[PDB]
């Protein structure tokens, strides 16, 4: 009936590094997706209270959104690029699981996922 707290985005006990793949994920992948016409429902955690989705978090136990991913990248929360990629994949899969295939949100997620894959296919070598 309430929203859960949003995912953690900062942790001073985790080691921190910057890598060229993590920089690409932030400056190319995240930035490109954020600017997309269909990004707005994905820029913050799903507000199941405001959107009147009382079962959202009864079904989705691993919420993820691009606002969280951005702040995780900015806080050097991720050590491996694959951690970040997994969060993007979780965000898309949540949307496909909760919603129905003809819903506008799913059409939006599919277009963003296509763009995501196009950018991930160009991920630079480490």
């Amino acid at each position: 009936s309430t929203n859960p707290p949003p995912p953690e985005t900062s942790n001073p006990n985790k080691p921190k590094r910057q890598t060229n793949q993590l920089q690409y994920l932030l400056r190319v992948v995240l930035k490109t997706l954020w600017k997309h016409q269909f990004a707005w429902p994905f820029q913050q955690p799903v507000d199941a209270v405001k959107l009147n989705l009382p079962d959202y978090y009864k079904i989705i136990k691993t919420p993820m959104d691009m606002g969280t991913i951005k702040k995780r990248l900015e806080n050097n929360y991720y050590w491996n690029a694959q951690e970040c990629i997994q969060d993007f994949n979780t965000m898309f899969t949540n949307c496909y699981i909760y919603n129905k295939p003809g819903d506008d949100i799913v059409l939006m997620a599919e277009a963003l996922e296509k763009l995501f894959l196009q950018k991930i296919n160009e991920l630079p070598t480490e």
């Binding site: 429902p41 009147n52 989705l53 909760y98 919603n99 819903d103 506008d104 949100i105 939006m108």
Partner: peptide
């Protein structure tokens, strides 16, 4: 913005 949340957007 949503006409029906998730189902139909209005923008």
């Amino acid at each position: 913005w949503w006409i029906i949340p998730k189902v139909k957007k209005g923008c």
